[PDB]
């Protein structure tokens, strides 16, 4: 878009126318132318449906046909024749009307429909789909609070999985720094099951923090609306000749037709409802005395399944996309021348154009498209390498 005026004014030029021458012377014257200097059509103000989840867009268009000088141338121258014246211145002047300077452009009178070539609309649709499936979009309002509380689960597992494997090897000096403790405390037991029962309070607050965020994802975050926005502007230059227207013147003229396809969609899948109805055990209601040491691996069954589900591509469903149609260019006549014348410064004429229109229909394949989840954070991918190499393999 550029600067353009809407006030309809007229100018009188003498010939311153132328111257013348024749021578010286021358013257013448111248023328114134117223003649008319510019023209502006009527203001088209439309509305749309307003629900309780997302506001539907409304059609809107303006456009302006401004003409400059006449360148115126011277033529014438011368021559014448017648014668014366023538011367141268441148115326013979021969003025032109501003309401008929769009003959050199493929634009209708309403300044809305723009004839797009086959080598422009086809390339604009492939560059958007290649970024959604591969993972290249912008986050939304609900995606900010969803990914903030979801990354805290995989982060706390770093100090828990690495500390669980250290007990089976015989290196107790590494598990003290991960459990927020001190290395200036000796142990009393000698067995592998008695050393873990000594520092029981060192992992009690870490257990309540897992259920504090897991119950809010499978019951609140997975039962709302997650909007996503994709921005991709495509603009090419078209030079035509004409044867023438017115015147014759043749116116010889130039124009730049731009298009920014914005498609709004949300996450919609049938297999995501199975992970939202699963439960989790409570460490406060289970006595850790009779339970043996081999229980941490069996407890990570509902937690480990969530880390592997947030990395697989999940399909999405579109709603109503907007196709912007903005054209920019000039036309020099160378116116034528015438015749013769011468121276141258020779009688010339310069005219400008600036239209804007947003489409209603969207482009989306009916056969589905695997969209990568935005939960592919660096801190979340480190938890998968600690399970399939030590806790499973």
């Amino acid at each position: 878009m550029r600067a353009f005026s809407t006030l309809d004014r007229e100018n009188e030029t003498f010939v311153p126318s132328v111257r013348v021458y024749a021578d010286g012377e021358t013257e013448d014257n111248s023328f114134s132318l117223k003649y008319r200097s510019n023209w502006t059509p009527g203001r088209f103000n439309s509305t749309g449906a307003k629900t309780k989840q997302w506001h539907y867009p409304s059609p809107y268009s303006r456009g302006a046909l401004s003409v400059t000088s006449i360148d115126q141338g011277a033529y014438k121258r011368s021559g014448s024749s017648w014668g014366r014246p023538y011367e141268e211145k441148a115326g013979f002047g021969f003025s032109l009307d501003a309401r008929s300077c769009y003959s050199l452009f493929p634009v209708s009178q309403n300044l809305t429909y723009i004839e797009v070539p086959q080598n422009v609309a086809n390339r604009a649709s492939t560059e958007v789909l290649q970024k959604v499936t591969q993972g290249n979009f912008n986050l939304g309002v609900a995606l900010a609070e969803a990914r903030s509380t979801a990354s805290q689960l995989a982060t706390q597992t770093i100090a828990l999985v690495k500390a669980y494997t250290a007990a089976r090897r015989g290196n107790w000096r590494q598990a003290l720094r991960y459990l927020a403790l001190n290395e200036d405390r000796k142990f009393r037991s000698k067995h592998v099951a008695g050393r873990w029962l000594e520092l029981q309070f060192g992992w009690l607050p870490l257990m309540s923090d897992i259920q504090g965020a897991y119950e809010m994802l499978t019951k609140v975050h997975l039962q709302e609306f997650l909007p996503m926005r994709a921005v991709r502007q495509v603009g090419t230059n078209i030079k035509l000749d004409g044867r023438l227207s017115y015147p014759a013147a043749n116116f010889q003229t130039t124009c730049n037709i731009s298009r920014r396809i914005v498609i709004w969609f949300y996450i919609n899948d049938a297999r995501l409802a199975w992970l939202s109805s699963l439960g989790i055990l409570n460490p406060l209601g289970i006595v850790w005395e009779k339970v043996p040491f081999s229980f941490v691996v069996d407890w990570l069954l509902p937690v480990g399944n969530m880390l592997e589900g947030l990395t697989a591509p999940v399909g999405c469903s579109y709603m109503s996309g907007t196709v912007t149609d903005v054209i920019t260019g000039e036309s020099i006549i160378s116116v034528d021348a015438p015749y013769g014348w011468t121276v141258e410064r020779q009688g010339t004429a310069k005219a400008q154009i600036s239209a804007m229109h947003r489409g209603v229909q969207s482009v989306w394949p009916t056969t589905g498209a695997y969209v990568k989840s935005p939960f592919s954070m660096v801190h979340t991918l480190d938890a998968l390498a600690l399970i399939r190499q030590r806790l499973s393999r």
Binding site: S46, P59, S108, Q109, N110
Partner: protein, 65 residues
């Protein structure tokens, strides 16, 4: 509640002064007024070269949305 017959401004951009209606009504006169010199051959169908822009102006700016 409000009304539901409008809210889109679709018929305004289709049937109006700045639409395609003024282009289909200007060729209908020359299609028959310029070929009636065979039977009639007179000066009669010459008053329609100025009433096109006048009738479309007083019939469109009646309400104005």
């Amino acid at each position: 509640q409000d009304l539901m017959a409008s809210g889109n401004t679709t018929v305004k951009a289709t049937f109006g002064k700045d639409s395609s209606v003024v282009k289909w009504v200007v060729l209908a006169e020359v299609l028959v007024g310029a070929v009636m010199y065979m039977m009639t051959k007179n000066v009669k169908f010459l008053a329609g070269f100025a009433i096109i822009s006048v009738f479309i102006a007083v019939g469109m700016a009646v309400v104005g949305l």
